[PDB]
Structure formats: structure tokens, C-alpha cells
Design a protein around this nucleic acid. Structure first.
Ligand SMILES: CC(C)C[C@H](N)C(=O)NS(=O)(=O)OC[C@H]1O[C@@H](n2cnc3c(N)ncnc32)[C@H](O)[C@@H]1O
Ligand SMILES: [Mg+2]
Ligand SMILES: [Zn+2]
Length: 860
RNA sequence: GCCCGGAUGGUGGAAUCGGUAGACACAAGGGAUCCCUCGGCGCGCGCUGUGCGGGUUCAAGUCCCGCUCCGGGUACCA
């Protein structure tokens, strides 16, 4: 043990030891109690940034802690390797997506090894290899056989010249991000998984996930959006087809004053033939973007169809309009408007002078005031013929029933959740195992032909995908005839939905999952990833686990017992617009900034001389180039400093705006820990401790040690407030540095304390603690050392602190034997001259005593 | 727009079930890796102070009603 702490002479040594003894490689040991601690797997984007560091440090803190409690901990790592970025990056780099990705993986792997996360590298997976995606192919063909898969027309973003489909990240400020041509809606048939067949189960089972946070549970209920209502069918005067709408407010029906139909609805197309105002508005509607966001800010717009639908309870002709907020693709392409009682309908009717009819009374039973806005609150009905007078429940049921009677309405459960579109028309993904025969029939790729392998050795022109460009690739023979395979590939969420199960058995060749293995490990005891994955990934992940359950491959109902969503690590983001309108994101450390009197950024240049557009803080990521790589710091300070500082910044679940200021604190603290063990072990082996011979100064200090163990255990294991854990450990280190380490008792006691501190820091700063555990001569490798237990008999307190308030203002603090009555505390409180000062002239009207904590004398 | 979160000294944050505001740290200043000062306004004291406005309570960073700004997601970024 060198006096000075040189992490560079330590971290790599300890890292080689973990690779040689395979410390973190585990099996299905049934003699041990398992713990599966899983962190959401990285997309191999290029480099790690502090967002990954945060996520993976949290997971490793939990993994090592659980291992010290004596459990068999899987903590696996892999690469969620398909996706969009590799395509653009390939072109920009005169490469192909496959090798760019494998190098990215080689690199990030090395970065992860150098932060010393105790992964089971024997179970590493890469989702872009056929050894992986073959099973999702097979699986998807089983889903099609069970009737959970179908094809429908779906709106996509489409640069009409390049004739290529764009993701929404790629459409910008109107136009595309390549060139000056405007994106367009295009309806393209695509493959869908009926996640809506599992909607109720997904909704209901949220009430069983008592160790998931409510943020995520609510976000998911509201996303599923279950609803009971009615579907009403209308006839239309000079049109031989019916219209169907769905409403949750059948009670407001008699106030339906118009219908809206989608730009692409057949009726609007028929009408647009003879109406050039309508036709121009429909052609206008192709530029409506595919995205709830921009779809809901847009000005609401419409044209009258000229057609007139018959209200089936009043027999009153009501106009049908075409409107830019009703989409053929989601629902029946028609809605009914009740402007008196739906705010969006009010605003449309206000704009285009449509009749706004009130049919629901206010809470006190007079007619509502509709001059400024729709009345949305449920109420008694008037203006509603035979339904007048009924309350909300009643009117719902009578209108529903009348409507059923007539045979034009029906009750219906309905969800905001839509089925899951898994077709992409991009190269870099798992191919979808369907086939079209010469016939024209469609079926699954048969089993003798799985996996359908994506070729890796390609040249990419940007424009097309090479599996569509070469028409020989799609050629095959099925049922003894020429057949063509599908050249669309899977949504890369498909691979991130079952990886947690494959990590249990990654080299099993006989099928998707070794169920013995999978059931030993599952369910995941803790799942750690970003709050960004609240809905999408986490819904598909649960949906998929259920589908595997229904296939009989896993016993659990839910995949993950506890979920821990970390906050996002944020960074400023900047760009300049290039020569042909390409956005060029610049990194914060290249950006020269002049700043507000309040701290907000006012101007910004790069070194080369470009006015940057400042976009604010946002998640670190390669997309916007605002990632800070940890690699520089690790080589300056050590992995243990970077790790400690991340966990000390802020609590795991809070979103953190990254800053560099603060690392020295972490580095200096580690030098003090090092210096303390060094000075203590340099002096030799220690006497056995004599618990009950201690000075009172020693009893006090042994109490703070044991109280720290209790708090840190709770902070890591139950609260996951790592910052407070670390803070409690610093406090203690501060007292330990002031304790004289001189007689044998002091030295025995410092040994206990230090053995405990070192073990407690271990999950956070394992390289330094592995080393220090050897200088203190602890048993074996710290990686398997037992986690420390607080001795209750050391933590007994004799006295406690009471705050004395007077009308709620603190006037003193007093120590008072724990065993103290209210009468005792008043008296003592009375002795304080500053309390006395505020009791003269006045009377004690009331007294509040919170046992052992606070006295408040309420005073006139 | 809609759904979910957030805001505390120059800075990151602490206060775990409504009960001491600023633990533990970074920066800064002064002194010899160690000390010491460190919310604001005016001394071994008083007032005030948790984004803004009201409210409940003996007591509010915490709870109630109404807002601003910031971030996450919004179904083809992952
Ligand atoms: C399980 C699948 C859907 C995860 C996906 N491959 C993914 O999110 N990959 S990732 O972006 O490389 O992230 C890996 C994990 O780190 C979290 N994370 C990313 N970016 C982050 C920022 N900027 N701050 C905090 N956390 C970030 C992400 O949520 C993943 O959990
Ligand atoms: Mg602030
Ligand atoms: Zn284009």
C-alpha cells in the first residue's frame, strides 16, 4: 500500500482478477437464492455518455449489494443492435451498418469493462445476430398462427421524390432533413400485433405491481385509455353507405349538431368530385403529419361536405364536414360533434358558425351559459325530448337502450391503445418472416427456412434498402412454387421486448428459451432504466411476457417485480443549418457561450464561426451530440471517482442536468478514505475489541458507526437514495478522522469502523475497496464479504434533542433524557432565557408536545 | 395540445409519516494538505427566507385552490 492513491495502478489489476476468476459469472445454482438485477441494454451508438454511466452504476451498486447479502446475482449485458442511426452513419462513413455496429460494440464494451461493472460477460448477446433474431422470427410466425397478427393500411411519412419512408426524428421544421421537399402522408399496408387483445389484462395487472412507481402506472393507464361507450350508426341522404361514430357521452346525443369525417373517408372523396373547395382541402390534408403532437396544435380546419346525415332520434338533417383532426386509420373515420358539451367541438363550431345546442343542465339545474365555452361536466338532460329530466347514468342507459332497440347503436368497450405496427421499410433490422406466393396468397415463412438472414455484406445508396434494391434476394420457393419474401424488417422494439428472457439462456440452440433456466431466474427482481421508457418499451415488455406465458414458456404473470426509473441526465444542445439545410449539431464543449444574468444562454458560436441555434437542455444522446463521454475523466481520476460522483449528484429518480463541478469532492473523499486506512494499517494487527470497557467518547463513536450501517442499508436497499447513503458515509469518515487512534481500544475500534466503511463503499467504489479490504486483512475477496449488520445494543440512545418553538418560531434546542415526560420538557424549556423572554406578558393558551422531538407553546 | 414529473444559497443537493430549512459536498474569500467564513437584510441579537398568487393548520419545502417556467413521453429516436 503506497501512501498516495494512484487509481491507474489499481483499477486494471482488479479488473483482470475479476476476468480471471470469473467472479461475476453465475449459473442456475439451486443451493443459492437468486437475484436478477437487470439494466436496460444499450444501443451501440458509438461511445458511452454519462446517461449510460448513471444507469449502469445504479444497477451495479444494486448487484454488488445483493451479492454481499449472499444472493446469486445475474447482472447481464448486451447490445440492442439494430436501428436507424447506423444507416445514416454508414453512408456518411463509406461503410455498411453491420461493421460500424460491431466496432461500436467493441469500443463501448471496453469502456464498460473499465468502469468495472460486475457483468456476466459469458451471457453477452447482440440482437443483430441471427442466433438471436431467429427466435423472434419463429415466434412471430406462431403469433400469426394464433391470430394475433394482421395487415392493415397505415399512414407513414414519405418524401415523395426520394420515395423512401422517414421516421419522425427525420422530418423537421416542415420539410425533410436531407433536402428541400415537403414530407407527405402515405398509406401503406403494414403488419400489426394485436396488443389490444391484451389491453384489459395489461390495465388490470397494474394493481398487482405494488413495487412499480405510480408515475409509470398512471402514465400507462392513461395511455391504454379504457373507455365504455356506444357506437352509433347514421344513414346519409344521397350516399348508399352508413357512417359509424363512437361516443363516451351518449347522454349528450341530442346535442349532436354535426359530423366530422376524415379527409380520406370515402364520403369526403365522393363529395370532393363536384366540390373544388373540398377537393383542395383534402389535397391539403396529405401534409398533416403523423404524430399526435403536431396533429393537436395545428389549427383545426374543415370544409362542409354538402352531405347531410339523419339524426336517428330527432330525424333532423345534420351536416357532415371534413376535418383535419379525424383520421381514417384510428377508429371508424367519423366522429359526432356536440359543441355545447365538448370543448374541441365548441371551438370548431365557433369558427365555422355551426349550431351550438345545449342539452345538459348546470349543477343547480338551470340552462348552461355557452357564450364562452362548452359545459363538459355531466348533468341532468333538457332539450332532449323523451330523455329530459334523467341524470347522467340514467340518460346513458336510456339512450343506449333506445339505440340498441332501433338497431343502430351498441355498447362497446374502447381503448386509446392502438395495435402495434411492426413493419419498417429500412435495411437494418430483422426481416419479417412472411411470404407471398405466385398465387397471391400470403403466409408465414415455413420453419425449414428460418432464420431469414439479413445480409451483412452490402453497399448502401441512402435512397433504397439493398434487400429491396436486389430483387433476387426476395426470391424463394414455398409449397413448391415461386414465392417472394417480405423485405420489410421489424421495429427494433421487438428485440428489446424479450431480451430479459434470453439472457437466462443465450446459447440454447433448441429454442427461444430453456424454460428451466428461465424459470430459475425470472421474474426480474429489479429492472433499471430511464423514465423515457415509461410507456412504449415497458408496455411491450409486459405484453411480450404475457404472450410467452401464454405460449407456456414462463411461469410468471409479470416480468419485473420492482422497477426503478432513473431520471435523465441532460445537456445543452446546439446546431447550425448547413449548406443544403442539414442540421449540424455541435457539442457543448465546442460551443462558445455568452450567458444571462440569470444563467440562461443568450448567444452561442462554435470555434469555426457559426451562430448556433440553442435548443435548451435535453437528454444526452448521440442524436444531438450533447453526450459527455466518461473516458477522459476515468483516465484522469479513476472509475471509482466517476462512479461515486454520479451516485452522489442526486437521487436516482431525479433528472440531473450534467455539470463537471463536484468531481474533486468525490476524488478527495477517496484520498481521505485511503489515507485513513493507510495510517491505520501501517501500525499493525489489532487487539480483540472489549465492547463493554469503552470510554463514553468511544461508545458514542461506535454508535455512529452502527447507526450509519443501518441508514446506508436502508438508503440502498429500500429507499434507493444513494446520495444520502454516501453522505452518511462521509459524516462518519469525518468523525473517524478526529477520533484519536492510539490506545489498543481506539485501534480495535477503528478496525471495526474501517472494515465496515470499506464494505459499505464497495458497491460504489469497488476497486479501491477491493484493495483496502486486503490491507485491513479482511476475509477473502470483498466481492463476497458479508454486508455489515448494525448491532442494536450499540445504537441505544440515552438522550434526545427537543426543539422548543413559541407560536411556531424556534427559540431553543435542548437535550432531554429520552425517558422524559411533557412536564419534564416544559420545565426544562422554561429555563431557557430566550423562551422565558417570549413568555412574559403573555399566557400559554395551548401546548403541543410531539414526543421526543418538539415542544410548541402557543401564546397570546 | 394532451399524460407524467420537477423548481430549495453562487452550484449539486438534505430535511424518510405536516414538525429545527440548507445535512453532505462543489465553487468562492481569507489564513497555514490542514484550518476558518460562507441564504438575505439590519451581532453573545431581530426580522426574513424553499419558482409566483391565495388558502388550511399551533406548525407548510411538505397539504388545498389558481399560475409560470423547465424536462420526459406523445405510438417510425432508442
Ligand atoms: C430496453 C431498450 C428499449 C433500451 C434501449 N436499447 C436504450 O434506451 N438504449 S440506450 O439509449 O443506449 O440507453 C441505455 C439505458 O440508458 C438510459 N439512458 C440513455 N440516455 C440517457 C440519458 N441521457 N440520461 C439518463 N439515462 C439515459 C436509457 O433509459 C436506458 O435505460
Ligand atoms: Mg435555484
Ligand atoms: Zn428528402
Amino acid at each position: 500500500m503506497q501512501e498516495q492513491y494512484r487509481p491507474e495502478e489499481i483499477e486494471s489489476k482488479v479488473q483482470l482478477h475479476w476476468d480471471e476468476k470469473r467472479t461475476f459469472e453465475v449459473t442456475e445454482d439451486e443451493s443459492k437464492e437468486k437475484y436478477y438485477c437487470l439494466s436496460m441494454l444499450p444501443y451501440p451508438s458509438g461511445r458511452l455518455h454519462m446517461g449510460h454511466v448513471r444507469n449502469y452504476t445504479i444497477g451495479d451498486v444494486i448487484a454488488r449489494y445483493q451479492r454481499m447479502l449472499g444472493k446469486n446475482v445475474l447482472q447481464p449485458i448486451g447490445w440492442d443492435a439494430f436501428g436507424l442511426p447506423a444507416e445514416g452513419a454508414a453512408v456518411k462513413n463509406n461503410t455498411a451498418p453491420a461493421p460500424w455496429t460491431y466496432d461500436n460494440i467493441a469500443y463501448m464494451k471496453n469502456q464498460l469493462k473499465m468502469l468495472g461493472f460486475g457483468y456476466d460477460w459469458s451471457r453477452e448477446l447482440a440482437t443483430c445476430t441471427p442466433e438471436y433474431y431467429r427466435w423472434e422470427q419463429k415466434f412471430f410466425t406462431e403469433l400469426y398462427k394464433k391470430g394475433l397478427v394482421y395487415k392493415k393500411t397505415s399512414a407513414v411519412n414519405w418524401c415523395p421524390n426520394d420515395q423512401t419512408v422517414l421516421a419522425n426524428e427525420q422530418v423537421i421544421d416542415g420539410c425533410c432533413w436531407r433536402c428541400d421537399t415537403k414530407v407527405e402522408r402515405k398509406e401503406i399496408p403494414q403488419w400489426f400485433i394485436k396488443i389490444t387483445a391484451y389491453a384489459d389484462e395489461l390495465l388490470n395487472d397494474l394493481d398487482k405491481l405494488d413495487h412499480w412507481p405510480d408515475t409509470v402506472k398512471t402514465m400507462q393507464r392513461n395511455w391504454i385509455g379504457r373507455s365504455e361507450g356506444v357506437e352509433i350508426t347514421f344513414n346519409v341522404n344521397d350516399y348508399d353507405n352508413t357512417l359509424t361514430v363512437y361516443t363516451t357521452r351518449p347522454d349528450t346525443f341530442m346535442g349532436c349538431t354535426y359530423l366530422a369525417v376524415a379527409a380520406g373517408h370515402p364520403l369526403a372523396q365522393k363529395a370532393a368530385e363536384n366540390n373544388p373547395e373540398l377537393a383542395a382541402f383534402i389535397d391539403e390534408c396529405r401534409n398533416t403529419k403523423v404524430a399526435e403532437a403536431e396533429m393537436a396544435t395545428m389549427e383545426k380546419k374543415g370544409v362542409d361536405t354538402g352531405f347531410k346525415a339523419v339524426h336517428p332520434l330527432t330525424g333532423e338533417e345534420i351536416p357532415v364536414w371534413a376535418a383535419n383532426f379525424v383520421l381514417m386509420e384510428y377508429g371508424t373515420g367519423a366522429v359526432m360533434a356536440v359543441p355545447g358539451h365538448d370543448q374541441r367541438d365548441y371551438e370548431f363550431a365557433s369558427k365555422y358558425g355551426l349550431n351550438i345546442k345545449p342539452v345538459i343542465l348546470a349543477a343547480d339545474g338551470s340552462e348552461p351559459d355557452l357564450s364562452q365555452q362548452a359545459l363538459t361536466e355531466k348533468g341532468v338532460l333538457f332539450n332532449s325530448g323523451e330523455f329530459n329530466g334523467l341524470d347522467h347514468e340514467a340518460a346513458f342507459n336510456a339512450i343506449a337502450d333506445k339505440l340498441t332497440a332501433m338497431g343502430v347503436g351498441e355498447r362497446k368497450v374502447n381503448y386509446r391503445l392502438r395495435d402495434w405496427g411492426v413493419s419498417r421499410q429500412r435495411y437494418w433490422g430483422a426481416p419479417i418472416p412472411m411470404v407471398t406466393l405466385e398465387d397471391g396468397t400470403v403466409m408465414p415463412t415455413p420453419d425449414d427456412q428460418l432464420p431469414v438472414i439479413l445480409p451483412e455484406d452490402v453497399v448502401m445508396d441512402g435512397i433504397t434498402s439493398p434487400i429491396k434494391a436486389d430483387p433476387e434476394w426476395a426470391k424463394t420457393t414455398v409449397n413448391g412454387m415461386p414465392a417472394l419474401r417480405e423485405t420489410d424488417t421489424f421495429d427494433t422494439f421487438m428485440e428489446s421486448s424479450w431480451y430479459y428472457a434470453r439472457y437466462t439462456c443465450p446459447q440454447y440452440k433448441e429454442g427461444m428459451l430453456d424454460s428451466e433456466a428461465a424459470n430459475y431466474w425470472l421474474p426480474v427482481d429489479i429492472y433499471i432504466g430511464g423514465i423515457e421508457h415509461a410507456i412504449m418499451h415497458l408496455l411491450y415488455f409486459r405484453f411480450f411476457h404475457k404472450l410467452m406465458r401464454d405460449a407456456g414458456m414462463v411461469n410468471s404473470d409479470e416480468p419485473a417485480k420492482q422497477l426503478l426509473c432513473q431520471g435523465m441526465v441532460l445537456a445543452d444542445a446546439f446546431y447550425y443549418v448547413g449548406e443544403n439545410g442539414e442540421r449540424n449539431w455541435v457539442s457543448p464543449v465546442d460551443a462558445i457561450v455568452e450567458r444571462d444574468e440569470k444563467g440562461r444562454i443568450v448567444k452561442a458560436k462554435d470555434a469555426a464561426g457559426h451562430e448556433l441555434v440553442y435548443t435548451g437542455m435535453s437528454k444526452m444522446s448521440k442524436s444531438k451530440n450533447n453526450g459527455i463521454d466518461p473516458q477522459v475523466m476515468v483516465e484522469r481520476y479513476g472509475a471509482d471517482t466517476v462512479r461515486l460522483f454520479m451516485m452522489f449528484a442526486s437521487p436516482a429518480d431525479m433528472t440531473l442536468e450534467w455539470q463537471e463541478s463536484g468531481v474533486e469532492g468525490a476524488n478527495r473523499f477517496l484520498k481521505r478514505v485511503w489515507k485513513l486506512v493507510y495510517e491505520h494499517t501501517a501500525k499493525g494487527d489489532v487487539a480483540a475489541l472489549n465492547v463493554d470497557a469503552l470510554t463514553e467518547n468511544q461508545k458514542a463513536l461506535r454508535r455512529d458507526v452502527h447507526k450509519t450501517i443501518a441508514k446506508v442499508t436502508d438508503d440502498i436497499g429500500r429507499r434507493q437514495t444513494f446520495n444520502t447513503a454516501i453522505a452518511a458515509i462521509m459524516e462518519l469518515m469525518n468523525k473517524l478522522a478526529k477520533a484519536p487512534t492510539d490506545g489498543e481500544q481506539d485501534r480495535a475500534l477503528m478496525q471495526e469502523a474501517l472494515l465496515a466503511v470499506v464494505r459499505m463503499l464497495n458497491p460504489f467504489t469497488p476497486h479501491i475497496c477491493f484493495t483496502l479490504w486486503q490491507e485491513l486483512k479482511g476475509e477473502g475477496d470483498i466481492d463476497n464479504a458479508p454486508w455489515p449488520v448494525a448491532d442494536e445494543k450499540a445504537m441505544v440512545e440515552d438522550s434526545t434533542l427537543v426543539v422548543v418553538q413559541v407560536n411556531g418560531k424556534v427559540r431553543a434546542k435542548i437535550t432531554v433524557p429520552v425517558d422524559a415526560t411533557e412536564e419534564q420538557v416544559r420545565e426544562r424549556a422554561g429555563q431557557e432565557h430566550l423562551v422565558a423572554k417570549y413568555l412574559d406578558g403573555v399566557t400559554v393558551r395551548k401546548v403541543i408536545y410531539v414526543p421526543g422531538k418538539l415542544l410548541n407553546l402557543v401564546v397570546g
